Amino acid sequence: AANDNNVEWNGLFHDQGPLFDNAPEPTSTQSVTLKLRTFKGDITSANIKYWDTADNAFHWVPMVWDSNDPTGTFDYWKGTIPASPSIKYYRFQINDGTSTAWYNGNGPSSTEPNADDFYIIPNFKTPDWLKNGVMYQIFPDRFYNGDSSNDVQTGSYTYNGTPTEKKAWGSSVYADPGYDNSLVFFGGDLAGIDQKLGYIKKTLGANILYLNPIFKAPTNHKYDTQDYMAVDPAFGDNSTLQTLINDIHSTANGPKGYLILDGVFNHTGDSHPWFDKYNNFSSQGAYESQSSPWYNYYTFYTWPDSYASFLGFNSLPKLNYGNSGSAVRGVIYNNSNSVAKTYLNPPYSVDGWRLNAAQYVDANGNNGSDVTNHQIWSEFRNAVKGVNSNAAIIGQYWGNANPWTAQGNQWDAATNFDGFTQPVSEWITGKDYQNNSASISTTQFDSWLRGTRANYPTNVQQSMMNFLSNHDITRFATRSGGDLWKTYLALIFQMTYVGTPTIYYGDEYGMQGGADPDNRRSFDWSQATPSNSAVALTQKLITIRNQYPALRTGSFMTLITDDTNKIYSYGRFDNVNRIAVVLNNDSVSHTVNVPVWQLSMPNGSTVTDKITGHSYTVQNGMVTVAVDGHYGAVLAQ
Ligand SMILES: OC[C@H]1O[C@H](O[C@H]2[C@H](O)[C@@H](O)[C@@H](O[C@H]3[C@H](O)[C@@H](O)[C@@H](O[C@H]4[C@H](O)[C@@H](O)[C@@H](O[C@H]5[C@H](O)[C@@H](O)[C@@H](O[C@H]6[C@H](O)[C@@H](O)[C@@H](O)O[C@@H]6CO)O[C@@H]5CO)O[C@@H]4CO)O[C@@H]3CO)O[C@@H]2CO)[C@H](O)[C@@H](O)[C@@H]1O
Ligand SMILES: OC[C@H]1O[C@H](O[C@H]2[C@H](O)[C@@H](O)[C@@H](O[C@H]3[C@H](O)[C@@H](O)[C@@H](O[C@H]4[C@H](O)[C@@H](O)[C@@H](O[C@H]5[C@H](O)[C@@H](O)[C@@H](O)O[C@@H]5CO)O[C@@H]4CO)O[C@@H]3CO)O[C@@H]2CO)[C@H](O)[C@@H](O)[C@@H]1O
Ligand SMILES: OC[C@H]1O[C@@H](O[C@H]2[C@H](O)[C@@H](O)[C@H](O[C@H]3[C@H](O)[C@@H](O)[C@@H](O)O[C@@H]3CO)O[C@@H]2CO)[C@H](O)[C@@H](O)[C@@H]1O
Ligand SMILES: OC[C@H]1O[C@H](O[C@H]2[C@H](O)[C@@H](O)[C@@H](O[C@H]3[C@H](O)[C@@H](O)[C@H](O)O[C@@H]3CO)O[C@@H]2CO)[C@H](O)[C@@H](O)[C@@H]1O
Ligand SMILES: OC[C@H]1O[C@H](O)[C@H](O)[C@@H](O)[C@@H]1O
Ligand SMILES: [Ca+2]
Ligand SMILES: [Ca+2]
Ligand SMILES: [Ca+2]
């Protein structure tokens, strides 16, 4: 490069990783020093332009040359944004004579962008254990039956006129004639999870468990809560839960663990005493009497049969959050004995909440995604963090969750359907997560990923729940048509990307399944051993991620987007390690010359494909590696 009236985009780079930002989660008194990379001698001047919410105006900070990288290929320019309590958004103006380029969350641009700027949110912090961990999601009734004595038998009880049905482990989840899909039970329970912690924390290595609903409810999924204060009898009792938590937190059976529970706060089930549609309690519920002490917990259009609910489901009456200080806000999160605080305090001390149907939470039966909804989650955050600042808050949302994350006053992160699940699905399987035809190329995949990461503050990106499948979509293995190699590829990407890798129970061995309820099949053990190639790889990949902080909180830089050979390569790096990931999405092998010079890997230095152990030497800024179809290499040093 040179001063030739031309800014070379290829040399430009900035994100909030260690090498470029000295304070990614600053307080009100910490200034933020940013470094912008360019090719050596490529520019004449650079400036930081930031919008300060304190005075609704743009501010200008000229940058100064700081240093060259170790390879002498790049320049690092530096500038500092002053400390204050206000949210700020910045972008860079880069000039080389008559050539000007702009750069922000979405990368380089010839024209000045007006969105996707980088975020500075003083005092906003997401749990570091979440950014650095690996999560494992379990749908309780389908994981492991550790205690047959609490099993729901066929006919054990009836819900809304339909008796329960017990299935033999491994059999179909579909209810037989006379029964209902939501009342089919296999016997999975908390004792079972506890007895299988060795598999989770050791065989695989995940240190975070996220469970679907576990509180008393008539269905097998239990999103129709009957009692938030009691573990459902089929899963055990509150004592069973305390034991599981102790064993998860224990460091004697593996790495320290964390537990995230599913918080179903938008609505309750129609069998909850506050509503009591079928008179299952001596108390008077809202459905039973307009004089009920809980009458105003719900919204009736025509008492008692027409009321606000979750997506028209009468079995899920919607809670009326009213105004600040309401009884409903009290029982859900404000009270010390609320649902949210009870489990965050001893003798439970869980580590977080996954917020079900979070976008709908509102007052008066309204549908959320409004001022009131965000006000509620802001109060929720204060209540939760007040009890445990390191308790995680992850909201369910299918699209861009910027509205609930980008001001640092609500959630720490969200279910990454839009920034992870969907793009990964369409790139690898050629199907969207609902198993409908939808395919994207490598260049499109890369662009999609960048644009979605740019929707969030950096700490939020690093805390997103990144799963290949989950209880509301089709299994990855079904979308892949049963091709296990596609799962191999997906796992390598998942374990080396930005955000919390999240494994939906069974995905690690290639479990198949269509739409709900077929995506909740019973866990086929004996398939859960290193003898299964996907399980062995999963274990290896988790060990790799845990070895390199760069894979969890390091910068992310695109290296190769080859649509001809279907090769995707990106680097994860920080002040200590530089890692070049090389993915082959083709059905045949490809030998790739990886431009590791972009990550500043010194010539003559050694790089190791942590997956195979095969060592390589960097020469002329390159490293040549052969990669099988639907597979990948993780070249680290
Ligand atoms: O009269 C005042 C002033 O006049 C002169 O400077 C002016 C200069 O003539 C004019 O071109 C312009 O300068 C531009 C420059 O053209 C741009 O390239 C840019 O300069 C920055 C450069 O791009 C960066 O790479 C960085 O340079 C670093 C290197 O990266 C380091 O490796 C190191 O290299 C030096 C090495 O250590 C020495 O042994 C020797 O080999 O020389 C090497 C090159 O100097 O250090 C340099 C310097 O830190 O940083 C550069 C910025 O300093 O942007 C410039 C500003 O737009 O404008 C100049 C006005 O000041 C005259 O040279 C000055 O002495 C005099 O004070
Ligand atoms: O919440 C959903 C929302 O999420 C995302 O929005 C976020 C942005 O991506 C992010 O950059 C940040 O936005 C800041 C912005 O960075 C900051 O500069 C300031 O915005 C300025 C514009 O930069 C400036 O150009 C001007 O905007 C003009 C615009 O140029 C003109 O074309 C026309 O549209 O009139 C606009 C109004 O003047 O002024 C604004 C401020 O007045 O402030 C922004 C925050 O308000 O944060 C966003 C929210 O988190 C997605 O990008 C977005 O699509 C989603 O709707
Ligand atoms: O709806 C199908 C559609 O999905 C697209 O995926 C990405 C977009 O590429 C990406 O732009 C977008 O991310 C943000 C966008 O850049 C902003 O302009 C603004 O709209 O906020 C968005 C927040 O997500 O996300 C979508 C994922 O839904 C595919 O690119 C496109 O090919 C496909 O048809
Ligand atoms: O038989 C009625 C319907 O049953 C099925 O829908 C169930 C889901 O199976 C159950 O998980 C739950 O959905 C929740 C979903 O899992 C959660 O991620 C989302 O955020 O909130 C949903 C509600 O809490 O409840 C529904 C409704 O009972 C089945 O899929 C559907 O077709 C049947 O009509
Ligand atoms: O899908 C990746 C691999 O699949 C099969 O093993 C092919 O024999 C091999 O050529 C290819 O690299
Ligand atoms: Ca130039
Ligand atoms: Ca059982
Ligand atoms: Ca009653």
Side-chain angles (χ1 to χ4, degrees), residues 14-26 31-35 90 118-120 458 555 575:
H14 179 273
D15 77 353
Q16 305 184 314
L19 283 166
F20 311 95
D21 188 331
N22 78 327
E25 290 180 299
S31 66
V32 181
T33 292
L34 309 165
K35 290 183 180 177
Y90 68 85
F118 289 99
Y119 297 84
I120 289 183
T458 302
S555 293
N575 299 169

Side-chain angles (χ1 to χ4, degrees), residues 273 275-276 278-285 288:
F275 202 68
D276 202 16
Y278 313 90
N279 187 28
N280 291 305
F281 302 90
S282 54
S283 47
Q284 294 287 308
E288 298 175 306

Side-chain angles (χ1 to χ4, degrees), residues 210-213 221-225 228 260-268 310-311 316 318 321 353-362 373 377 380 393-398 411 415 417 465 470-472 520:
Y210 153 42
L211 313 177
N212 285 96
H221 58 259
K222 307 193 182 301
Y223 278 93
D224 64 324
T225 312
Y228 296 94
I260 295 177
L261 294 183
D262 204 320
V264 196
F265 311 141
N266 174 246
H267 48 266
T268 70
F310 171 79
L311 271 38
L316 307 170
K318 192 175 196 295
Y321 278 75
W353 287 105
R354 171 276 187 173
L355 316 177
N356 183 67
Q359 79 187 77
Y360 303 107
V361 168
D362 210 335
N373 171 267
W377 288 127
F380 182 83
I393 299 175
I394 306 174
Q396 163 68 34
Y397 197 67
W398 302 79
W411 315 341
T415 47
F417 289 100
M465 188 195 277
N470 94 331
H471 64 294
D472 291 329
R520 305 164 185 189

Side-chain angles (χ1 to χ4, degrees), residues 49-60 81-90 117 120 122:
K49 176 175 181 174
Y50 73 86
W51 174 271
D52 192 343
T53 57
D55 59 9
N56 289 170
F58 280 112
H59 303 277
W60 194 254
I81 290 184
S84 95
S86 68
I87 286 178
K88 303 175 187 69
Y89 312 96
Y90 68 85
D117 284 334
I120 289 183

Side-chain angles (χ1 to χ4, degrees), residues 202-473:
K202 287 178 172 299
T203 302
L204 298 188
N207 64 152
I208 306 170
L209 284 73
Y210 153 42
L211 313 177
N212 285 96
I214 62 167
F215 304 136
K216 190 168 187 176
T219 64
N220 51 199
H221 58 259
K222 307 193 182 301
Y223 278 93
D224 64 324
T225 312
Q226 180 173 62
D227 189 358
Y228 296 94
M229 311 310 292
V231 169
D232 187 283
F235 295 169
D237 58 22
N238 286 50
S239 179
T240 313
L241 173 57
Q242 295 171 54
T243 298
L244 171 61
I245 295 170
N246 299 322
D247 290 350
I248 288 178
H249 286 170
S250 172
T251 59
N253 60 175
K256 181 188 182 309
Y258 301 87
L259 178 63
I260 295 177
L261 294 183
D262 204 320
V264 196
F265 311 141
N266 174 246
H267 48 266
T268 70
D270 56 357
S271 306
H272 185 115
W274 298 337
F275 202 68
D276 202 16
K277 188 173 188 175
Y278 313 90
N279 187 28
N280 291 305
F281 302 90
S282 54
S283 47
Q284 294 287 308
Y287 183 87
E288 298 175 306
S289 173
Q290 307 195 86
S291 289
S292 168
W294 308 290
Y295 185 65
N296 292 306
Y297 279 32
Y298 304 90
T299 301
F300 295 90
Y301 295 116
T302 297
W303 184 77
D305 289 296
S306 178
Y307 46 84
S309 62
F310 171 79
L311 271 38
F313 286 107
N314 280 172
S315 60
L316 307 170
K318 192 175 196 295
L319 288 172
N320 166 32
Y321 278 75
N323 303 59
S324 301
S326 69
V328 169
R329 295 188 188 210
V331 304
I332 296 299
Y333 62 88
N334 282 321
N335 297 343
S336 177
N337 63 345
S338 66
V339 181
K341 293 189 176 178
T342 291
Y343 296 98
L344 288 169
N345 279 146
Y348 297 103
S349 298
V350 302
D351 309 272
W353 287 105
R354 171 276 187 173
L355 316 177
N356 183 67
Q359 79 187 77
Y360 303 107
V361 168
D362 210 335
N364 306 155
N366 292 314
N367 246 204
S369 290
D370 47 25
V371 176
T372 300
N373 171 267
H374 289 110
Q375 201 280 311
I376 290 165
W377 288 127
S378 65
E379 298 186 339
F380 182 83
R381 186 186 183 81
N382 295 330
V384 169
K385 301 295 182 174
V387 170
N388 179 0
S389 60
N390 290 301
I393 299 175
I394 306 174
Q396 163 68 34
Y397 197 67
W398 302 79
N400 179 357
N402 176 289
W404 295 270
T405 50
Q407 297 193 84
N409 63 173
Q410 296 164 63
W411 315 341
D412 292 314
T415 47
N416 212 357
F417 289 100
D418 195 54
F420 186 80
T421 314
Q422 194 69 295
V424 170
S425 185
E426 305 195 5
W427 183 57
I428 303 179
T429 76
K431 308 282 193 56
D432 62 15
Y433 49 59
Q434 300 185 68
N435 205 192
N436 282 308
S437 296
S439 178
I440 56 179
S441 57
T442 301
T443 49
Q444 297 178 308
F445 180 53
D446 175 72
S447 175
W448 188 319
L449 294 171
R450 188 189 69 249
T452 49
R453 288 199 306 283
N455 288 329
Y456 308 104
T458 302
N459 54 174
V460 170
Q461 283 174 45
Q462 306 166 331
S463 309
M464 296 295 285
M465 188 195 277
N466 296 348
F467 46 86
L468 299 181
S469 320
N470 94 331
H471 64 294
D472 291 329
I473 58 177

Side-chain angles (χ1 to χ4, degrees), residues 41 68 113 143 154 165 182 207 221 253 271 324 411 413 436 446 475 493 495 529 545 600 608:
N68 296 125
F143 188 59
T154 299
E165 168 174 37
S182 301
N207 64 152
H221 58 259
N253 60 175
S271 306
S324 301
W411 315 341
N436 282 308
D446 175 72
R475 286 281 180 170
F493 176 71
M495 295 298 157
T529 69
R545 191 180 181 84
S600 288
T608 305

Side-chain angles (χ1 to χ4, degrees), residues 57 86 110 114 167-168 185 218 225 256 294 331 348 467 480 500 526 554 561 574:
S86 68
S110 57
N114 59 193
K167 297 282 189 176
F185 302 78
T225 312
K256 181 188 182 309
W294 308 290
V331 304
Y348 297 103
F467 46 86
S480 299
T500 314
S526 80
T561 54
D574 56 29

